[PDB]
């Protein structure tokens, strides 16, 4: 029976982009009203940022930033939708849309404009060597987001995360950096860790999988348990550069003949394997 102002409670706008604040006055089918003015004001501000008179037209505080997209002279003022050009962080707030009507009186509605920024997600490996203390092994960055994006992790390894917030290239945005700290081992070498980034601007959370890289010395192993042959195999990153056979006393006995990894015994052996990280040995009593 009464004239109601149709408008959303909140309007999500993007920084740098242009948004329209919807505000329409619903008048019942057979009800007659006279709208003579439209007013736009900010909560806490001294005056009105946009005013539209039925015969005098529009008046703006920032004439090059604001516009009445559906209000014109020589037409009934029913749509007070206002377009805001080049959104700024200072534009985030509660706005009032007013309709000066007769004989029903002024009709208002409050709209909460929220300035957002879609962050760019990047995930990279933090290649490290073997250490006792826990060090970062994965990095997940969510650059320039408003509000700051929430970064979480999923792993089959017990790694603790460290998150640090630094301001982005644009004011009001935050570059969220998240490191995945874990004590390195040969087991986690090649194994993957997933990074989940959550933000209001995304359709669904973005998942970023990262393969772990560990630089470790050789993990020496001998196979082959009256003539016999023993082979020396070791796992390292980078792969072994050199293999060497010897004994506890010193040089190889007169029956044992070796060349790198392969050793021939004719009717205690030590295998020294070297890579970029260092050299490791494996004692075997024969």
């Amino acid at each position: 029976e009464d004239v109601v102002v149709q408008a959303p409670t909140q309007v999500p706008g993007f920084l740098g982009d242009s948004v329209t604040l919807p505000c329409y006055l619903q008048v019942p089918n057979m009800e007659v009203t006279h709208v003579s003015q439209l007013t736009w004001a900010r909560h806490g501000e001294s005056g009105s940022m946009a005013v539209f008179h039925q015969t005098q037209g529009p008046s703006y505080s920032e004439s090059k930033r604001l516009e009445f997209v559906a209000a014109r002279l020589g037409a009934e003022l029913r749509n007070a939708s206002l377009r805001m050009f080049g959104l700024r962080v200072e534009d985030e707030g509660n706005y009032t849309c007013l309709f000066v009507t007769f004989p029903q009186g002024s009709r208002s509605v409050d709209i909460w404009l929220r300035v957002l920024a879609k962050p760019q997600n990047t995930a990279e490996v933090q290649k490290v060597q073997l250490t006792g203390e826990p060090v970062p092994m994965a990095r997940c960055v969510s650059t320039g987001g408003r509000p700051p994006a929430q970064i979480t992790w999923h792993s089959d390894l017990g790694g603790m995360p460290n998150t640090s917030q630094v301001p982005g290239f644009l004011s009001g945005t935050v570059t969220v950096t998240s490191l995945w700290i874990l004590v390195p081992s040969s087991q986690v070498d090649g194994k993957n860790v997933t990074c989940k980034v959550e933000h209001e601007s995304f359709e669904k959370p973005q998942l970023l999988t990262v393969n772990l890289t560990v630089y470790y010395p050789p993990e020496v192993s001998i196979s082959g348990y009256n003539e016999a042959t023993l082979t020396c195999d070791a796992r390292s990153n980078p792969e072994p550069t050199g293999y060497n056979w010897s004994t506890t006393m010193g040089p190889l006995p007169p029956f044992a003949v070796a060349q790198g990894a392969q050793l021939l015994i004719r009717p205690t052996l030590i295998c020294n394997v070297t890579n970029a990280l260092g050299a490791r040995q494996a004692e075997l009593t024969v």
Binding site: W153, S155, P161, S178
Partner: protein, 218 residues
């Protein structure tokens, strides 16, 4: 002020609230009561005059056989709330285990993990929880999530210190003091210690942080 619980269980018809109190001091009385503004005593046990169950709980609750598990027979929607199992002894005074009863739909046990820790039995497991996005943090707590119950292991209030004594049947090395609250230790780990370990951080405005760590013991 917030009501601190030791165990959280979902609502059920044949719902049982476990309370295993230790054999310590001169036993005076063991009692069950519903936490609220109005006095609501459920059952009171005397070591000389036996058990006495008050109305209107006399037709709803019962006991079987240091264990005071409170069993229910057809519990109503109103039975959702905070329950207390208090043990009064000399010279300690009071021992209290607070059990929280939550709605069947509101209770969540199927929560995903963030990190998987594998450890050999007998070793010490060190669990860490650092603030990631929000600071200053007002409260920090550690929980063990089981498919039918949640148990509070640690609780530290940094803005205004509170009374918290874990009623968990396992030794947990922890310190709420400044510069020590982030790390909690589980010494001489057993095979039974396997499960979900959730960390919860509370801030000023209301923004929270959850970090679930799954433990597997060989």
């Amino acid at each position: 002020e917030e009501v601190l619980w030791h165990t959280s269980v979902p609502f059920a018809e044949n719902m049982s609230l476990e309370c295993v109190y230790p054999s310590m001091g001169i036993l005076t009385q063991v009692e069950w009561f519903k936490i609220g503004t109005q006095q609501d005593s459920i059952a009171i046990f005397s070591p000389t005059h036996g058990m006495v169950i008050r109305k209107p709980y006399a037709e709803r609750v019962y006991f079987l056989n240091n264990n005071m598990t409170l069993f229910f027979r057809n519990a109503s929607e109103d039975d959702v709330g905070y329950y207390s199992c208090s043990l009064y002894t000399y010279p300690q005074g009071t021992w209290q285990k607070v059990i929280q009863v939550v709605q069947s739909d509101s209770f969540e046990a199927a929560v995903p993990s963030n990190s998987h820790i594998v450890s050999e039995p007998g070793k010490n497991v060190t669990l860490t929880c650092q603030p990631q996005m929000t600071w200053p943090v007002q409260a920090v707590r550690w929980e063990k999530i089981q498919p039918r119950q949640i148990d509070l292991l640690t609780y530290c209030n940094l803005v205004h210190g509170r009374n918290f004594t874990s009623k968990f049947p396992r030794q947990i090395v922890s310190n709420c003091s400044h510069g020590r609250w982030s790390v909690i230790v589980i010494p001489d780990v057993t095979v039974s210690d396997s499960g979900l370990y959730r960390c919860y951080l509370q801030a000023s405005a209301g923004e929270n942080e959850t970090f679930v760590m799954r433990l597997t013991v060989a």
